[PDB]
Amino acid sequence: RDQAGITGTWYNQLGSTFIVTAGADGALTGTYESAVGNAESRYVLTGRYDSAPATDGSGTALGWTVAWKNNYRNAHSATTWSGQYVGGAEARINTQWLLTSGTTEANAWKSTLVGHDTFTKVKP
Amino acid sequence: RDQAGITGTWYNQLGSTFIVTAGADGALTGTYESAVGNAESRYVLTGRYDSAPATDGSGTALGWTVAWKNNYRNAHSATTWSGQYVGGAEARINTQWLLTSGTTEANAWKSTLVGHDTFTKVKP
Amino acid sequence: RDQAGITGTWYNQLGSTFIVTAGADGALTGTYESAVGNAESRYVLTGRYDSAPATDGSGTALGWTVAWKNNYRNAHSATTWSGQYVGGAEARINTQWLLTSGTTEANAWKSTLVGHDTFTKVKP
Amino acid sequence: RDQAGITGTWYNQLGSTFIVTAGADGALTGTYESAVGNAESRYVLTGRYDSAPATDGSGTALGWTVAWKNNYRNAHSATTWSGQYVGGAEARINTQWLLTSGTTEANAWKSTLVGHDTFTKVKP
Ligand SMILES: O=C(CCCC[C@@H]1SC[C@@H]2NC(=O)N[C@@H]21)NCCN1C(=O)c2cccc3c(N4CCc5ccccc5C4)ccc(c23)C1=O
Ligand SMILES: O=C(CCCC[C@@H]1SC[C@@H]2NC(=O)N[C@@H]21)NCCN1C(=O)c2cccc3c(N4CCc5ccccc5C4)ccc(c23)C1=O
């Protein structure tokens, strides 16, 4: 269990802030603040992690979602990050993400961005 | 709000079963059973949706995660689906997904599968 | 060798037209016309396929790129499709694609769309 | 035209080597050697780039494919990279990639890896 390793405040390469609690049962709960895009302040996130990872030096699989609606803005979109937690002196969460916007059926082909974020426990 | 539209039992093209409740506040909670892969029975899922979508015929953005650990198996992996709900006679959730396995740093380049699932309210 | 199987005119679910020749050496050459987006008429494509696939009923891996510049328009973007050819009565090329736009460094996080196209030998 | 900027030898974070020539007409031709996976020596690549990019500080969109068959091995797979070239003192090609394996129809859901490579003109 990397419950203690995951729980806390993380920062990515864009200067976004991910604040998460890992539950003993595999839950992830917290808030996300994006440094970029159609976003202001904090947004709810929820997700899941592997609470019993392999003991062979592998990372810990996890993922989470943010819907980009809060009390300030609604960007009619949702991002999911999928990745793994790697513990140790320079702990990191290495992710790839999919960001889908609500679209008409005609525009569905251009609904989804893909990218990658790396989170660390220390900021830019 | 497509709270009522989203809530329920959905099936994809592989014969997997997604059982979800949509909360008024943007939460998604439920269980997932995969017809394929290193999986048996139900797994917890959690996610988020846009509870106030655009009124212009656009779909409703949403996403969710499953960590592939339950009481029967642990596949040391997590999938996130990102997509949109489209209401109407033939309601569907159109998704793309990222499935990350825990890996060593040496194998991280081959950690993540990508695919697409389409869910409907009626099964194969 | 599915050189003969691949060579020809293919259509996707959007009504786009892919015209390709497969070389004995693994080359793919041809033109692409998109039914959607910032595109008009034909664009050059090039790519590669596995000219000696497994004999066990597996599909044939292949990919190709289009840069969205021709004599009519320049959309400062490029798409790559990655996928497999499946032969037989209802032959199909099943792909996932990445479409990158040129961006400033500040906007690089939103540079790349992801999607999926299925090509068949008969049109909508 | 970043024909001169693109042409040359590039290295990614895995220690792979990409050797490319950019044509005046938008072509990319060359060889790829992977430091990882089911690969040995050089493989043919082909692709396309935007030969007339925006003059506003944007990167130059490009993509290319490798089919993982040469005279030494056949991995029954193909990778496509989609990304942009960014010129200047520390020139880089920032990419995301899709790697599809030939599979049976039953295994198609697990056919495609996704990742990201950053290429520079100087090696690890
Ligand atoms: O901004 C937000 C909320 C904050 C998101 C922050 C992200 S989460 C991942 C990353 N990590 C991080 O910490 N922070 C960032 N939500 C909307 C985000 N958004 C999309 O959803 C979207 C979805 C689909 C297409 C496009 C899009 N194009 C592609 C090119 C193109 C070409 C011709 C015509 C049309 C288009 C459309 C452009 C921008 C967008 C977009 C775009 O901003
Ligand atoms: O190795 C090569 C040639 C060299 C590729 C080098 C890459 S190009 C991108 C990157 N940049 C670079 O410079 N060098 C690397 N070709 C085959 C590569 N390859 C796939 O195509 C593949 C395709 C689909 C699934 C899987 C795969 N899983 C995912 C997890 C899973 C779980 C349960 C059961 C099954 C599976 C299957 C594992 C490995 C592979 C794989 C795998 O090695």
Coordinates of C-alpha atoms and ligand atoms in Angstrom, one line a residue:
Chain A
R1 CA 0.0 0.0 0.0
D2 CA 1.3 3.4 -1.2
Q3 CA -1.7 5.0 0.6
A4 CA 0.8 7.2 2.5
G5 CA 3.0 7.7 -0.6
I6 CA 0.1 8.9 -2.8
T7 CA -1.8 11.1 -0.3
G8 CA -0.8 14.7 -0.5
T9 CA -0.2 17.6 -2.9
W10 CA 1.3 17.1 -6.3
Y11 CA 2.3 19.5 -9.1
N12 CA 2.7 18.9 -12.8
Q13 CA 4.9 20.4 -15.5
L14 CA 2.2 23.0 -16.3
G15 CA 2.1 24.2 -12.7
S16 CA -1.3 22.5 -12.0
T17 CA -2.0 21.3 -8.4
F18 CA -3.5 17.9 -7.6
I19 CA -4.5 17.4 -4.0
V20 CA -5.5 13.8 -3.2
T21 CA -6.3 11.4 -0.4
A22 CA -5.8 7.7 -1.0
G23 CA -8.2 5.4 1.0
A24 CA -7.3 2.0 2.3
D25 CA -9.9 0.5 0.0
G26 CA -8.5 1.8 -3.3
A27 CA -10.3 5.2 -3.4
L28 CA -8.9 8.5 -4.5
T29 CA -10.6 11.7 -3.6
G30 CA -9.5 15.3 -3.8
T31 CA -9.4 18.5 -5.8
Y32 CA -7.6 19.7 -9.0
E33 CA -6.6 23.2 -10.0
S34 CA -5.4 23.6 -13.6
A35 CA -2.8 26.3 -14.5
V36 CA -4.1 26.3 -18.1
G37 CA -7.4 26.2 -20.1
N38 CA -10.9 27.1 -19.3
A39 CA -10.6 26.6 -15.6
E40 CA -10.6 28.6 -12.3
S41 CA -10.0 27.5 -8.8
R42 CA -10.5 23.9 -7.6
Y43 CA -12.6 21.1 -9.1
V44 CA -13.6 17.8 -7.6
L45 CA -11.8 14.7 -8.5
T46 CA -12.3 11.1 -7.8
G47 CA -10.5 8.0 -8.9
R48 CA -9.1 4.5 -8.0
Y49 CA -5.6 3.0 -7.3
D50 CA -4.2 -0.5 -6.8
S51 CA -4.0 -0.8 -3.0
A52 CA -1.9 -4.0 -3.2
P53 CA 0.7 -3.5 -5.9
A54 CA 3.3 -6.0 -7.1
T55 CA 6.3 -6.3 -4.7
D56 CA 8.8 -6.5 -7.7
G57 CA 9.7 -2.8 -8.1
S58 CA 6.7 -2.1 -10.4
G59 CA 4.8 1.2 -10.1
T60 CA 1.2 1.4 -8.7
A61 CA -1.5 1.8 -11.3
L62 CA -4.1 4.5 -10.7
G63 CA -6.5 6.9 -12.4
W64 CA -8.8 9.8 -11.8
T65 CA -11.4 12.1 -13.4
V66 CA -12.2 15.8 -13.2
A67 CA -15.4 17.2 -14.7
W68 CA -14.6 20.9 -15.5
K69 CA -17.6 22.3 -13.7
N70 CA -17.4 24.1 -10.4
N71 CA -19.1 27.2 -9.0
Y72 CA -17.1 29.5 -11.2
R73 CA -17.1 27.9 -14.6
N74 CA -18.4 25.1 -16.7
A75 CA -16.1 24.0 -19.6
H76 CA -18.5 21.2 -20.7
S77 CA -15.5 18.8 -20.6
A78 CA -14.0 16.0 -18.5
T79 CA -10.4 14.8 -18.2
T80 CA -9.2 11.4 -17.1
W81 CA -5.7 10.7 -16.1
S82 CA -4.4 7.1 -16.3
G83 CA -0.9 6.3 -15.0
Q84 CA 1.3 4.9 -12.2
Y85 CA 2.8 6.1 -9.0
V86 CA 6.5 5.5 -8.5
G87 CA 7.8 5.9 -4.9
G88 CA 11.3 6.9 -3.7
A89 CA 13.4 10.0 -3.2
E90 CA 12.0 11.6 -6.3
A91 CA 8.5 10.2 -6.2
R92 CA 6.4 10.8 -9.3
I93 CA 3.0 10.1 -10.8
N94 CA 3.5 9.5 -14.6
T95 CA 0.2 9.9 -16.5
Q96 CA -1.4 10.0 -19.9
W97 CA -4.7 11.8 -20.1
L98 CA -7.9 12.1 -22.3
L99 CA -9.9 15.3 -22.3
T100 CA -13.3 15.0 -23.9
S101 CA -15.6 18.0 -24.7
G102 CA -19.3 17.6 -25.1
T103 CA -19.9 18.0 -28.9
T104 CA -22.6 17.6 -31.5
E105 CA -22.6 14.3 -33.4
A106 CA -21.1 16.2 -36.4
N107 CA -18.2 17.4 -34.3
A108 CA -17.5 14.2 -32.4
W109 CA -14.4 13.4 -34.4
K110 CA -12.7 16.4 -32.8
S111 CA -14.1 15.9 -29.2
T112 CA -11.0 14.4 -27.5
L113 CA -7.5 15.8 -26.7
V114 CA -4.7 13.5 -25.5
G115 CA -1.6 14.4 -23.5
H116 CA 0.7 13.4 -20.8
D117 CA 1.4 15.0 -17.3
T118 CA 4.2 14.1 -14.8
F119 CA 3.5 15.0 -11.2
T120 CA 6.0 15.5 -8.5
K121 CA 5.8 16.4 -4.8
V122 CA 7.8 19.6 -5.4
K123 CA 6.6 22.4 -7.7
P124 CA 8.1 24.5 -10.5
Chain B
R1 CA -29.0 17.3 -16.1
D2 CA -28.9 13.8 -17.7
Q3 CA -28.7 12.4 -14.2
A4 CA -31.7 10.2 -15.1
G5 CA -30.3 9.5 -18.6
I6 CA -26.9 8.2 -17.3
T7 CA -28.1 6.2 -14.3
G8 CA -28.5 2.6 -15.1
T9 CA -27.0 -0.5 -16.7
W10 CA -24.9 -0.1 -19.9
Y11 CA -23.2 -2.6 -22.2
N12 CA -20.3 -2.2 -24.6
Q13 CA -19.4 -3.9 -27.8
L14 CA -17.2 -6.5 -25.9
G15 CA -20.2 -7.5 -23.7
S16 CA -18.9 -5.7 -20.6
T17 CA -21.4 -4.4 -18.1
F18 CA -21.2 -0.9 -16.6
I19 CA -23.6 -0.2 -13.7
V20 CA -23.7 3.5 -12.7
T21 CA -25.5 6.0 -10.6
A22 CA -25.2 9.7 -11.5
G23 CA -25.4 12.1 -8.5
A24 CA -27.0 15.6 -8.7
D25 CA -23.6 17.0 -7.8
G26 CA -21.7 15.5 -10.8
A27 CA -20.6 12.2 -9.1
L28 CA -20.6 8.8 -10.8
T29 CA -20.5 5.7 -8.7
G30 CA -21.0 2.0 -9.6
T31 CA -19.5 -1.3 -10.7
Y32 CA -17.9 -2.6 -13.8
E33 CA -17.6 -6.2 -15.1
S34 CA -15.3 -6.8 -18.0
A35 CA -16.1 -9.5 -20.6
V36 CA -12.3 -9.7 -21.4
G37 CA -8.9 -9.6 -19.9
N38 CA -7.6 -10.4 -16.4
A39 CA -10.9 -9.7 -14.7
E40 CA -13.6 -11.6 -12.8
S41 CA -16.9 -10.3 -11.4
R42 CA -17.5 -6.7 -10.4
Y43 CA -15.0 -3.9 -9.7
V44 CA -15.6 -0.5 -8.1
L45 CA -15.8 2.5 -10.3
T46 CA -16.0 6.2 -9.7
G47 CA -16.0 9.2 -11.9
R48 CA -17.5 12.6 -12.7
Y49 CA -19.9 14.0 -15.3
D50 CA -21.0 17.5 -16.4
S51 CA -24.3 18.0 -14.4
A52 CA -25.2 21.1 -16.4
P53 CA -24.4 20.4 -20.1
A54 CA -24.8 22.9 -23.0
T55 CA -28.4 23.2 -24.2
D56 CA -27.4 23.2 -28.0
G57 CA -27.6 19.5 -28.7
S58 CA -24.0 18.7 -27.5
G59 CA -23.3 15.5 -25.6
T60 CA -22.5 15.4 -21.9
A61 CA -18.8 15.0 -21.0
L62 CA -18.0 12.4 -18.4
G63 CA -15.3 10.0 -17.3
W64 CA -14.6 7.2 -14.8
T65 CA -11.9 4.9 -13.5
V66 CA -11.7 1.2 -12.5
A67 CA -8.7 -0.2 -10.7
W68 CA -8.6 -3.9 -11.5
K69 CA -8.4 -5.2 -8.0
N70 CA -11.3 -6.8 -6.2
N71 CA -11.7 -9.8 -3.9
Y72 CA -11.0 -12.3 -6.7
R73 CA -8.1 -10.8 -8.7
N74 CA -5.5 -8.1 -8.9
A75 CA -4.4 -7.2 -12.4
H76 CA -2.1 -4.3 -11.2
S77 CA -3.8 -2.0 -13.6
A78 CA -6.3 0.8 -14.0
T79 CA -8.5 1.9 -16.9
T80 CA -10.0 5.4 -17.3
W81 CA -12.7 6.1 -19.8
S82 CA -13.3 9.6 -21.1
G83 CA -16.2 10.4 -23.3
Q84 CA -19.7 11.8 -23.7
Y85 CA -23.3 10.7 -23.1
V86 CA -25.7 11.2 -26.0
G87 CA -29.4 11.0 -25.0
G88 CA -32.4 10.0 -27.2
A89 CA -34.0 6.9 -28.6
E90 CA -30.7 5.1 -29.0
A91 CA -28.8 6.6 -26.1
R92 CA -25.1 5.9 -26.1
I93 CA -21.9 6.7 -24.2
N94 CA -19.0 7.1 -26.6
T95 CA -15.7 6.7 -24.9
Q96 CA -11.9 6.4 -25.4
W97 CA -9.9 4.7 -22.7
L98 CA -6.4 4.4 -21.3
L99 CA -5.4 1.2 -19.5
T100 CA -2.1 1.6 -17.5
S101 CA -0.3 -1.4 -15.9
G102 CA 2.2 -1.0 -13.1
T103 CA 5.6 -1.5 -14.6
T104 CA 9.3 -1.2 -13.8
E105 CA 10.9 2.0 -15.1
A106 CA 12.6 0.0 -17.8
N107 CA 9.2 -1.2 -19.1
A108 CA 7.3 2.1 -18.7
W109 CA 7.3 2.7 -22.4
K110 CA 4.9 -0.3 -22.8
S111 CA 2.7 0.4 -19.8
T112 CA -0.4 1.9 -21.4
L113 CA -3.1 0.5 -23.8
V114 CA -5.5 2.8 -25.7
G115 CA -8.9 1.9 -27.1
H116 CA -12.5 2.9 -27.6
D117 CA -15.7 1.5 -26.2
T118 CA -19.3 2.4 -27.1
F119 CA -22.0 1.7 -24.5
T120 CA -25.7 1.2 -25.1
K121 CA -28.7 0.6 -22.9
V122 CA -29.3 -2.7 -24.7
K123 CA -26.8 -5.6 -24.9
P124 CA -25.3 -7.9 -27.5
Chain C
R1 CA 1.4 -10.5 -48.0
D2 CA -1.9 -8.6 -48.1
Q3 CA -0.4 -6.3 -50.7
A4 CA -3.4 -7.1 -52.9
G5 CA -5.8 -6.9 -50.0
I6 CA -4.7 -3.4 -48.9
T7 CA -4.3 -1.8 -52.3
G8 CA -7.3 0.1 -53.3
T9 CA -10.0 2.7 -52.2
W10 CA -11.2 2.7 -48.7
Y11 CA -13.9 4.7 -46.9
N12 CA -14.4 5.5 -43.2
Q13 CA -17.4 6.2 -41.1
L14 CA -17.1 10.0 -41.7
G15 CA -17.2 9.5 -45.5
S16 CA -13.5 10.2 -46.0
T17 CA -11.7 8.4 -48.9
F18 CA -8.3 6.8 -48.5
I19 CA -6.6 5.7 -51.7
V20 CA -3.5 3.5 -51.2
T21 CA -1.0 1.3 -52.9
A22 CA 0.8 -1.3 -50.9
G23 CA 4.4 -2.1 -52.2
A24 CA 6.0 -5.5 -51.9
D25 CA 8.7 -3.9 -49.6
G26 CA 6.2 -2.7 -46.9
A27 CA 5.5 0.8 -48.4
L28 CA 2.2 2.6 -48.4
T29 CA 1.6 5.5 -50.8
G30 CA -1.5 7.3 -51.8
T31 CA -3.9 10.2 -51.2
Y32 CA -6.4 11.0 -48.5
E33 CA -9.6 13.2 -48.8
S34 CA -11.3 14.1 -45.5
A35 CA -15.0 14.6 -45.4
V36 CA -14.5 16.8 -42.3
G37 CA -12.3 19.6 -40.9
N38 CA -10.0 22.2 -42.4
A39 CA -9.4 20.2 -45.6
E40 CA -10.2 20.2 -49.3
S41 CA -9.5 17.7 -52.0
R42 CA -6.6 15.2 -51.8
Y43 CA -3.5 15.2 -49.6
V44 CA -0.4 13.0 -49.9
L45 CA -0.1 10.1 -47.6
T46 CA 2.7 7.7 -46.9
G47 CA 3.2 4.9 -44.5
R48 CA 4.3 1.3 -43.8
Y49 CA 2.7 -2.1 -43.3
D50 CA 3.9 -5.6 -42.2
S51 CA 4.5 -7.3 -45.5
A52 CA 4.9 -10.7 -43.8
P53 CA 2.1 -11.0 -41.2
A54 CA 1.6 -13.9 -38.8
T55 CA -0.2 -16.9 -40.4
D56 CA -2.4 -17.5 -37.3
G57 CA -5.4 -15.4 -38.2
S58 CA -3.9 -12.1 -36.8
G59 CA -4.5 -8.8 -38.6
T60 CA -1.7 -7.0 -40.5
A61 CA -0.2 -4.0 -38.6
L62 CA 0.1 -0.8 -40.6
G63 CA 0.2 3.0 -40.3
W64 CA 0.3 6.2 -42.3
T65 CA 0.6 9.9 -42.1
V66 CA -1.1 12.9 -43.8
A67 CA 0.3 16.4 -43.4
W68 CA -2.7 18.7 -44.0
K69 CA -1.1 20.9 -46.6
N70 CA -1.9 20.8 -50.3
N71 CA -2.3 23.3 -53.1
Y72 CA -5.6 24.5 -51.7
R73 CA -5.1 24.7 -47.9
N74 CA -2.7 24.5 -45.1
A75 CA -4.2 23.4 -41.7
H76 CA -0.7 23.4 -40.0
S77 CA -1.4 19.9 -38.7
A78 CA -0.7 16.2 -39.3
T79 CA -2.6 13.0 -38.6
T80 CA -1.2 9.6 -38.1
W81 CA -3.3 6.5 -38.2
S82 CA -2.1 3.3 -36.5
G83 CA -4.0 0.1 -36.9
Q84 CA -4.5 -3.3 -38.6
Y85 CA -5.9 -4.7 -41.8
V86 CA -8.3 -7.6 -41.4
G87 CA -9.0 -9.5 -44.7
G88 CA -12.1 -11.5 -45.7
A89 CA -15.6 -10.9 -47.0
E90 CA -16.0 -7.7 -45.0
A91 CA -12.4 -6.5 -45.1
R92 CA -11.7 -3.6 -42.8
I93 CA -8.8 -1.4 -41.6
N94 CA -9.4 -0.6 -37.9
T95 CA -7.4 2.4 -36.8
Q96 CA -6.7 4.8 -34.0
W97 CA -5.3 8.2 -34.9
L98 CA -3.4 11.2 -33.5
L99 CA -3.9 14.6 -35.0
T100 CA -1.3 17.2 -33.9
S101 CA -1.5 20.9 -34.7
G102 CA 1.5 23.2 -34.7
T103 CA 1.2 25.3 -31.5
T104 CA 3.1 27.7 -29.3
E105 CA 4.9 26.2 -26.3
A106 CA 2.2 27.7 -24.1
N107 CA -0.6 25.9 -26.0
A108 CA 1.3 22.5 -26.5
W109 CA -0.9 20.8 -23.9
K110 CA -3.9 21.2 -26.3
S111 CA -2.0 20.3 -29.5
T112 CA -3.2 16.8 -30.1
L113 CA -6.6 15.2 -30.9
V114 CA -7.2 11.4 -30.6
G115 CA -9.8 9.3 -32.3
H116 CA -10.6 6.1 -34.2
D117 CA -11.6 5.4 -37.8
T118 CA -12.8 2.2 -39.3
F119 CA -12.3 1.8 -43.1
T120 CA -14.2 -0.5 -45.4
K121 CA -14.1 -1.2 -49.1
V122 CA -17.7 -0.1 -49.5
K123 CA -18.9 3.5 -48.7
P124 CA -21.7 5.1 -46.7
Chain D
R1 CA 10.5 25.6 -44.2
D2 CA 12.3 23.8 -41.4
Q3 CA 13.6 21.3 -44.0
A4 CA 17.1 22.0 -42.8
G5 CA 16.0 22.1 -39.1
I6 CA 14.3 18.6 -39.3
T7 CA 16.9 16.8 -41.4
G8 CA 19.4 14.9 -39.4
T9 CA 19.9 12.5 -36.5
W10 CA 17.6 12.7 -33.4
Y11 CA 17.6 10.8 -30.2
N12 CA 14.8 10.2 -27.7
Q13 CA 14.7 9.7 -23.9
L14 CA 14.9 5.9 -24.4
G15 CA 18.2 6.2 -26.4
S16 CA 16.5 5.4 -29.7
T17 CA 17.9 6.9 -32.9
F18 CA 15.8 8.6 -35.6
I19 CA 17.6 9.5 -38.8
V20 CA 15.5 11.6 -41.2
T21 CA 15.6 13.6 -44.4
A22 CA 12.9 16.3 -44.9
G23 CA 12.0 16.9 -48.6
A24 CA 11.0 20.3 -50.0
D25 CA 7.6 18.8 -50.8
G26 CA 6.7 17.7 -47.3
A27 CA 8.2 14.2 -47.3
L28 CA 10.1 12.5 -44.5
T29 CA 12.2 9.5 -45.2
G30 CA 14.8 7.7 -43.1
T31 CA 15.5 4.9 -40.6
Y32 CA 14.7 4.3 -37.0
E33 CA 16.5 2.2 -34.4
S34 CA 14.7 1.4 -31.2
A35 CA 16.7 1.0 -27.9
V36 CA 13.8 -1.1 -26.5
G37 CA 11.3 -3.8 -27.5
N38 CA 11.3 -6.5 -30.1
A39 CA 13.7 -4.7 -32.5
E40 CA 17.2 -4.9 -33.8
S41 CA 19.1 -2.5 -36.1
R42 CA 17.5 -0.1 -38.4
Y43 CA 13.9 0.0 -39.8
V44 CA 12.5 2.1 -42.7
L45 CA 10.4 5.0 -41.8
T46 CA 8.3 7.4 -43.9
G47 CA 6.2 10.3 -43.1
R48 CA 5.1 13.9 -43.8
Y49 CA 5.6 17.4 -42.3
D50 CA 4.1 20.9 -42.9
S51 CA 6.6 22.5 -45.3
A52 CA 5.1 25.9 -44.8
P53 CA 4.4 26.4 -41.0
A54 CA 2.7 29.4 -39.4
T55 CA 5.1 32.3 -38.9
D56 CA 3.8 33.2 -35.4
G57 CA 6.1 31.0 -33.3
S58 CA 4.1 27.8 -33.6
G59 CA 5.8 24.5 -34.0
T60 CA 5.8 22.5 -37.3
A61 CA 3.4 19.5 -37.4
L62 CA 4.7 16.2 -38.6
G63 CA 4.4 12.5 -38.3
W64 CA 5.9 9.2 -39.4
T65 CA 5.5 5.5 -39.3
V66 CA 7.7 2.5 -38.8
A67 CA 6.6 -1.1 -39.5
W68 CA 8.7 -3.3 -37.2
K69 CA 9.9 -5.7 -40.0
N70 CA 13.4 -5.7 -41.3
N71 CA 15.9 -8.3 -42.4
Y72 CA 16.5 -9.4 -38.8
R73 CA 13.1 -9.4 -37.1
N74 CA 9.4 -9.1 -37.6
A75 CA 7.4 -7.9 -34.6
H76 CA 4.1 -7.8 -36.5
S77 CA 3.5 -4.3 -35.4
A78 CA 3.7 -0.7 -36.5
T79 CA 4.2 2.6 -34.6
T80 CA 3.1 6.1 -35.7
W81 CA 4.5 9.2 -34.1
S82 CA 2.5 12.4 -34.4
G83 CA 3.9 15.7 -33.1
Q84 CA 5.7 19.0 -33.7
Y85 CA 9.2 20.2 -34.4
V86 CA 10.2 23.2 -32.3
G87 CA 13.4 25.0 -33.6
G88 CA 16.0 27.0 -31.7
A89 CA 19.0 26.5 -29.5
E90 CA 17.5 23.4 -27.9
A91 CA 15.5 22.1 -30.9
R92 CA 13.1 19.2 -30.1
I93 CA 10.5 17.0 -31.7
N94 CA 7.7 16.5 -29.2
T95 CA 5.6 13.4 -30.1
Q96 CA 2.8 11.1 -29.0
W97 CA 2.8 7.6 -30.5
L98 CA 0.5 4.7 -31.2
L99 CA 1.9 1.2 -31.5
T100 CA -0.5 -1.4 -33.0
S101 CA 0.2 -5.1 -33.0
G102 CA -1.6 -7.5 -35.4
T103 CA -4.1 -9.4 -33.3
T104 CA -7.0 -11.8 -33.6
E105 CA -10.4 -10.1 -33.5
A106 CA -10.8 -11.5 -30.0
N107 CA -7.7 -9.7 -28.8
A108 CA -8.2 -6.4 -30.8
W109 CA -9.1 -4.6 -27.6
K110 CA -5.5 -5.0 -26.4
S111 CA -3.8 -4.3 -29.8
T112 CA -2.6 -0.7 -29.3
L113 CA 0.0 0.9 -26.9
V114 CA 0.1 4.7 -26.5
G115 CA 3.1 6.8 -25.3
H116 CA 5.1 9.9 -25.8
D117 CA 8.7 10.5 -27.0
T118 CA 10.8 13.7 -27.0
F119 CA 13.6 13.8 -29.5
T120 CA 16.6 16.1 -29.3
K121 CA 19.7 16.6 -31.5
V122 CA 22.0 15.6 -28.7
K123 CA 21.9 12.1 -27.1
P124 CA 21.7 10.6 -23.5
Ligands
LIG1 O1 -10.0 23.9 -20.7 C1 -10.7 23.0 -20.2 C2 -10.6 22.8 -18.7 C3 -9.2 22.6 -18.2 C4 -8.4 21.5 -18.9 C5 -7.0 21.5 -18.5 C6 -6.1 20.4 -19.0 S1 -6.5 18.8 -18.2 C7 -5.1 18.1 -19.0 C8 -4.0 19.1 -18.8 N1 -3.3 19.0 -17.5 C9 -3.5 20.1 -16.7 O2 -3.1 20.2 -15.5 N2 -4.2 21.0 -17.4 C10 -4.6 20.5 -18.7 N3 -11.6 22.3 -20.9 C11 -11.7 22.4 -22.3 C12 -10.5 21.9 -23.0 N4 -10.5 21.7 -24.5 C13 -11.2 20.6 -24.9 O3 -11.8 19.9 -24.2 C14 -11.0 20.3 -26.4 C15 -11.6 19.2 -26.9 C16 -11.5 18.9 -28.2 C17 -10.9 19.8 -29.1 C18 -10.3 21.0 -28.6 C19 -9.6 21.9 -29.5 N5 -9.5 21.6 -30.9 C20 -8.4 20.9 -31.5 C21 -8.0 21.6 -32.8 C22 -9.1 22.0 -33.6 C23 -8.9 22.4 -35.0 C24 -10.0 22.9 -35.8 C25 -11.2 23.0 -35.2 C26 -11.4 22.7 -33.9 C27 -10.4 22.2 -33.1 C28 -10.7 21.8 -31.7 C29 -8.9 23.0 -28.9 C30 -9.0 23.2 -27.5 C31 -9.7 22.4 -26.7 C32 -10.4 21.2 -27.2 C33 -9.8 22.7 -25.3 O4 -9.3 23.7 -24.8
LIG2 O1 8.6 -4.2 -29.7 C1 8.1 -3.9 -30.8 C2 9.0 -3.2 -31.8 C3 9.7 -2.0 -31.2 C4 8.7 -1.0 -30.5 C5 9.5 0.2 -29.9 C6 8.7 1.3 -29.3 S1 8.1 2.4 -30.7 C7 7.5 3.6 -29.4 C8 8.7 3.7 -28.4 N1 9.7 4.6 -28.8 C9 10.9 4.0 -29.1 O2 11.9 4.6 -29.5 N2 10.8 2.7 -28.9 C10 9.4 2.3 -28.4 N3 6.9 -4.2 -31.2 C11 5.9 -4.9 -30.4 C12 5.5 -3.9 -29.2 N4 4.4 -4.3 -28.4 C13 3.1 -4.1 -28.9 O3 3.0 -3.9 -30.1 C14 2.0 -4.4 -28.0 C15 0.7 -4.1 -28.4 C16 -0.4 -4.3 -27.6 C17 -0.2 -4.8 -26.4 C18 1.1 -5.1 -25.8 C19 1.3 -5.5 -24.5 N5 0.2 -5.8 -23.6 C20 -0.3 -4.8 -22.7 C21 -0.6 -5.4 -21.4 C22 -1.3 -6.7 -21.5 C23 -1.9 -7.3 -20.3 C24 -2.5 -8.6 -20.4 C25 -2.4 -9.3 -21.5 C26 -1.8 -8.8 -22.7 C27 -1.2 -7.5 -22.7 C28 -0.6 -7.0 -23.9 C29 2.6 -5.6 -24.0 C30 3.7 -5.4 -24.9 C31 3.5 -5.0 -26.2 C32 2.2 -4.8 -26.7 C33 4.7 -4.8 -27.1 O4 5.8 -5.0 -26.7

